[PDB]
Design a binder for this molecule. Structure first.
Ligand code: LRT
Lengths: 18, 353
C-alpha cells in the first residue's frame, strides 16, 4: 500500500527543514 | 450561471469587504514593521519550568511570569550559534514579523529582550502541542476535521500575503493547537517580505513547491501548493510526495503525479489537483480570482469563513489540560541550565533585536 511505502520511507517522524 | 443574482451580489460584496479589512490590516502592520518594539522585559522576570521543544538555534521553554503568574513559551536563541549557523537575518526577521503582525491564528509575541549570551522571544503559551502529534496519534483527520484546520490556514495565508509575506514553512510540525482547538502558527524564520519573486531554496522537502526546487524564481503561490500538501497529509495521514531521500522526493514533486486514497471525496481530490498544480498559470490561489478560487471551492461549501475567523465554530478536538502549565501534550527534552556569559557576544550583529 501507499501507507506501507510511507512507513518504509523512514520519514514518518518530525521532518527537518533543509 | 453558477450563482443567481442574490448569491453573486452577496459573494462579491463579501470579497470587496475582505479587501477593505486587509488594506487596513496592512497599514497597521507597516506602522509596526517600520518602528519595531524592543527590550520589553528581562530574564529575571520569569521562572523556567520545562523545555517544550529544541532546535538548532536553541530552546523553547515553558516559563511563568514571576509577577503576573502567567505562563509563556520563551524561545531562547544562542547568539554565537545563530551566527555560526549564519541565521542572523532569519532570527531578526522572525522577531520583526512577530511584533508587527496581528491575526487570530498567529502566535502572540508578548515580550522580547536580549542579554550577553542569548536572544529571548516570550510568546503566549499554546498548550495543546503540535498538530503533528495529534495527526500521527489518530492516523488521519476526517475531511470535516481537516477542513476546519485548512480554513484557518487559508485565512492566515490570505492575511500574510496581503502584507506581501510568503510563509514557506507550512507543515503539521509547525502548527500548534490552542486550548480552544484552533490553530496557532509560530515559526517565521523562513518568512520573507516579497512583492514580486524570490529564489531561496528553503523549507521542508515534502512541502516544497516544484518552482522552489527548480532554479526558476517563485512567488506567494508556493504557499498555496504547501496548503495542498497539508490538506492531503491531514486527510490521508501521510504526505502526497515521499521517498527515502529528499532528492527522490523532489523528483516526484516536479512530476506532480499525485495518487489519492480511495477514501478521499471527489470534492477533495478536485481541490487538491488544483492546489498541487505544477503549472503556475493554473494553480488555485495564483489565478485572477486569487484566494477566492479556494474559498469558493465545493469542498469548502460548508465552511462559515466569518465564524472561523471569529472562532465561533466548535472545534472537532479539544486538547486535554489538567491545569495551568500542563505540558502533557509535548514531548520530553533534556533539561540544561541557561548560562549567561560575563562578556557580551555578537552585540553588533543583534543591535536591532
Ligand atoms: N507559543 C508556543 N507555545 C508552545 C510551544 C511553542 C513552540 S514548540 O517548542 O512547540 N515548537 C518548536 C519549534 C517547532 N515548531 C513548533 C513547535 C515554539 C514556538 C512557540 C510555542
Amino acid at each position: 500500500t501507499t501507507y506501507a511505502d510511507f512507513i518504509a520511507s523512514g520519514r514518518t517522524g518530525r521532518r527537518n527543514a533543509i | 450561471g453558477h450563482m443567481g443574482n442574490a448569491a453573486a451580489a452577496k459573494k462579491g460584496s463579501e470579497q470587496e469587504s475582505v479587501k477593505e479589512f486587509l488594506a487596513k490590516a496592512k497599514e497597521e502592520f507597516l506602522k509596526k514593521w517600520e518602528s519595531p518594539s524592543q527590550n520589553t522585559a528581562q530574564l529575571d522576570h520569569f521562572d523556567r519550568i520545562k523545555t517544550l521543544g529544541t532546535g538548532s538555534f536553541g530552546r523553547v521553554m515553558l516559563v511563568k511570569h514571576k509577577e503576573t503568574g502567567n505562563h509563556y513559551a520563551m524561545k531562547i536563541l544562542d547568539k554565537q550559534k545563530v551566527v555560526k549557523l549564519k541565521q542572523i537575518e532569519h532570527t531578526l526577521n522572525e522577531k520583526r514579523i512577530l511584533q508587527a503582525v496581528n491575526f487570530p491564528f498567529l502566535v502572540k509575541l508578548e515580550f522580547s529582550f536580549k542579554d550577553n549570551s542569548n536572544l529571548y522571544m516570550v510568546m503566549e503559551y499554546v498548550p495543546g502541542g503540535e498538530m503533528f502529534s495529534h495527526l500521527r496519534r489518530i492516523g488521519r483527520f476526517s475531511e470535516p476535521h481537516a477542513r476546519f484546520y485548512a480554513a484557518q490556514i487559508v485565512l492566515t495565508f490570505e492575511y500574510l500575503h496581503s502584507l506581501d509575506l510568503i510563509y514557506r514553512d507550512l507543515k503539521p510540525e509547525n502548527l500548534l493547537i490552542d486550548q480552544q482547538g484552533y490553530i496557532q502558527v509560530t515559526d517565521f524564520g523562513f518568512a520573507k517580505r516579497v512583492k514580486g519573486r524570490t529564489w531561496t531554496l528553503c523549507g521542508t522537502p515534502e512541502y516544497l513547491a516544484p518552482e522552489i526546487i527548480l532554479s526558476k524564481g517563485y512567488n506567494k503561490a508556493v504557499d498555496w501548493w504547501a496548503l495542498g500538501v497539508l490538506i492531503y497529509e491531514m486527510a490521508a495521514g501521510y504526505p502526497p510526495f515521499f521517498a527515502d531521500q529528499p532528492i527522490q522526493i523532489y523528483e516526484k514533486i516536479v512530476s506532480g503525479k499525485v495518487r489519492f486514497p480511495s477514501h478521499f471525496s471527489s470534492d477533495l481530490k478536485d481541490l487538491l489537483r488544483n492546489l498541487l498544480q505544477v503549472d503556475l498559470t493554473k494553480r488555485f490561489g495564483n489565478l485572477k480570482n486569487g484566494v477566492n478560487d479556494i474559498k469558493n471551492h465545493k469542498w469548502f461549501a460548508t465552511t462559515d469563513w466569518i465564524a472561523i475567523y471569529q472562532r465561533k465554530v466548535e472545534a472537532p478536538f479539544i486538547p486535554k489540560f489538567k491545569g495551568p502549565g500542563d505540558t502533557s501534550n509535548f514531548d520530553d527534552y533534556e533539561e540544561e541550565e541557561i548560562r549567561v556569559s560575563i562578556n557580551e557576544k555578537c552585540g553588533k550583529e543583534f543591535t536591532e533585536f
